[PDB]
Amino acid sequence: CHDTIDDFRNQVYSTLYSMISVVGFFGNGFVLYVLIKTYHKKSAFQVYMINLAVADLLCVCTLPLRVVYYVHKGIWLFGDFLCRLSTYALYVNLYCSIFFMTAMSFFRCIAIVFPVQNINLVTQKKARFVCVGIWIFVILTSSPFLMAKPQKDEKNNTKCFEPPQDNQTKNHVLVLHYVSLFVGFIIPFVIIIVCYTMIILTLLKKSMKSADLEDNWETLNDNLKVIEVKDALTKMRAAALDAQKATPPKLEDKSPDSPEMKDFRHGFDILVGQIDDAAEQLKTTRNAYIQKYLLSSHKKAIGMIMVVTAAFLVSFMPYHIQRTIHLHFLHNETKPCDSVLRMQKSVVITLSLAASNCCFDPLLYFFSG
Numbered sequence: 001c002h003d004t005i006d007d008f009r010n011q012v013y014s015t016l017y018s019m020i021s022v023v024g025f026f027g028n029g030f031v032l033y034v035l036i037k038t039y040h041k042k043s044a045f046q047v048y049m050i051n052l053a054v055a056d057l058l059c060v061c062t063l064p065l066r067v068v069y070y071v072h073k074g075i076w077l078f079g080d081f082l083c084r085l086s087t088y089a090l091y092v093n094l095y096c097s098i099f100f101m102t103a104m105s106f107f108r109c110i111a112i113v114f115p116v117q118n119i120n121l122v123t124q125k126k127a128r129f130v131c132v133g134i135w136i137f138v139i140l141t142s143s144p145f146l147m148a149k150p151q152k153d154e155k156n157n158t159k160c161f162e163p164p165q166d167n168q169t170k171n172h173v174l175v176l177h178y179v180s181l182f183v184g185f186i187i188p189f190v191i192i193i194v195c196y197t198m199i200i201l202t203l204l205k206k207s208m209k210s211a212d213l214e215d216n217w218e219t220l221n222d223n224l225k226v227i228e229v230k231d232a233l234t235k236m237r238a239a240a241l242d243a244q245k246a247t248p249p250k251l252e253d254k255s256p257d258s259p260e261m262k263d264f265r266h267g268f269d270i271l272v273g274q275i276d277d278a279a280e281q282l283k284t285t286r287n288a289y290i291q292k293y294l295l296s297s298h299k300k301a302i303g304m305i306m307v308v309t310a311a312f313l314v315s316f317m318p319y320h321i322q323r324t325i326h327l328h329f330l331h332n333e334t335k336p337c338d339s340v341l342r343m344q345k346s347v348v349i350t351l352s353l354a355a356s357n358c359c360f361d362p363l364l365y366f367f368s369g
């Protein structure tokens, strides 16, 4: 037994931070470029996207300093201020990203679940105020990391990013860990679980209703081919009334009494009259009063669900489980080297995974933008 982790720590950190810095800087730099140079009006999603991009760039610009530290066999050479600023920067990026993803999911939920006054309840103006609130809250609550005591080794060398290794146990660090775990990870994660449950159930209801509208449109076209005659008519009439009751995907957000909805409902009314009269005359109505009405908002919601869920399971969750395990391990009487090694290797991996959160945000823009 010895400090066998020291070479592993410096090898894995140098590789992963170097990779996260390059992928993170170019990915979010590109996303920021594309969003800044926008001509069409900014969405609530775009407000959250710009803020995620900035929170990611703020942190990727500090990661090259972490790289220089581990390349130097754990010797800090930039002073106290830059050590406290590099530590603070990671926690600010991590908790800002958790809050922006939560706020984005919450907004998209109210948009999907409640399309009546959705465009007035979940506005770009509202997104801007929430983000400011998120920045102030995170910047203030994370400040103790800026006013922490400097770390020095046996040989009086300046250290940075040191974990409570062994017997460095404190009860109020454990109380701060729990408030942070609940407010900063468990409450945001529960809101996402609930919101995503509501979106998925809503998406099934709308997907099944659009299959019936696709089924009535299929029967109208099929019985038209059955003519080229009393049986085909009795079948098209029951379906044309059924299709009239259904709402098309194109006019899903608009009101039921809207003049856009009235036109589609009247189109089936003119077609029902032509059906009772009876083939090339009713084929004209289905190509002028109903062809236009018979969804992307559904694809952007699925894209968001997949990237954000992965970001929570892969990046945010292992760090928060490991921090709970680690802090309690310090309070335990017995500490063998075979357990202290596997604990320290996990700190290296779960922190690298937490820092890799900036790599998920360009993917959120491709799949949900």
Ligand SMILES: COc1cc(C(=O)NS(=O)(=O)c2ccccc2C)ccc1Cc1cn(C)c2ccc(NC(=O)OC3CCCC3)cc12
Pocket (backbone or CB within 6 Å): 091, 095, 137, 138, 141, 142, 143, 144, 145, 161, 162, 163, 164, 173, 176, 177, 180, 181, 183, 184, 319, 322, 323, 326, 327, 346, 347, 348, 350, 351
């Ligand atoms: C980020 O808070 C920690 C981080 C660590 C930590 O990560 N330590 S580690 O060695 O690097 C590591 C890495 C990977 C796995 C395991 C470990 C131990 C340990 C304890 C803590 C808890 C903690 C100790 N004080 C003195 C604090 C002061 C203020 C805050 N406010 C905070 O959080 O507010 C955010 C949530 C709401 C908004 C922002 C927390 C703390």
Ligand SMILES: CCCCCCCC/C=C\CCCCCCCC(=O)O
Pocket (backbone or CB within 6 Å): 171, 174, 175, 178, 179, 182, 183
């Ligand atoms: C700021 C108030 C917000 C309240 C939400 C936070 C929820 C925290 C609730 C329970 C966590 C239990 C805290 C007990 C401390 C255990 C650490 C110890 O002393 O060993």
Ligand SMILES: CCCCCCCC/C=C\CCCCCCCC(=O)O
Pocket (backbone or CB within 6 Å): 193, 196, 197, 309
């Ligand atoms: C609606 C989204 C669908 C995805 C499912 C998300 C829910 C997953 C939540 C928690 C998974 C927790 C698993 C943690 C295992 C590690 C525990 C351990 O062995 O110590």
Ligand code: NA
Pocket (backbone or CB within 6 Å): 052, 055, 056, 093, 097, 357, 358, 361
């Ligand atoms: Na992020």
